[PDB]
Amino acid sequence: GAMGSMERASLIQKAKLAEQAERYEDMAAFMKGAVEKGEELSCEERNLLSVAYKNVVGGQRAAWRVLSSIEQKSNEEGSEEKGPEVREYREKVETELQGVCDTVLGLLDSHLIKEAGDAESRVFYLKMKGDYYRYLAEVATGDDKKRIIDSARSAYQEAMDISKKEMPPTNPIRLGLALNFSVFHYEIANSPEEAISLAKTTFDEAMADLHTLSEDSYKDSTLIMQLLRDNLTLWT
């Protein structure tokens, strides 16, 4: 890999610079290089990895949605035939998105998850696995769509099981996992009731544990609680 000659510490330093410059593709490439050094990632380093790829795939998803909407409109009654270009370009963006997802899943499988023994790291990585299978599911239309959905579900479920055993209900990783798994239920699994139940129960159990927290931990937990409430407001 092109980052094989760069020191681990230099890759991490450069990922931080890339973030400051809003160069998320570079950030992701640096962090991929850092992961491929083979050492486990610290919390801060896991955050850099996640932020980089979230931003890259987030932009690809937004572009894919724009293109998919144009494509759908082209297939409506009375829409003039404009040739294969819209489908081709949506496919191009889709293929690039799938590539990024496969890259992230590959880092998780080789070998981040297997080396992650602490609850905070293992839950974080399993959440990411669920997230990137979810992005694959968003664009899946073929023989494997069910298996992709199930891969997302399974990763999220293992993360949920660990989180509930090992982390307090206010822990931001537990909260963020539940937020995203709830979205999975609503948007991917056609299970809005499960989505709403998960968001509500997670919010309420967190509320009950806030009293244990410092001011700074309270701030972290309540920010994600508000995202849960925002989704509940959207869905009810």
């Binding site: 997230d131 963020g176 937020l179 995203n180 979205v183 609503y186 948007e187 994600i224 995202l227 925002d230 989704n231 959207l234 869905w235």
Partner: peptide, 5 residues
Amino acid sequence: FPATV
């Protein structure tokens, strides 16, 4: 679109 982190 709903919130995720």
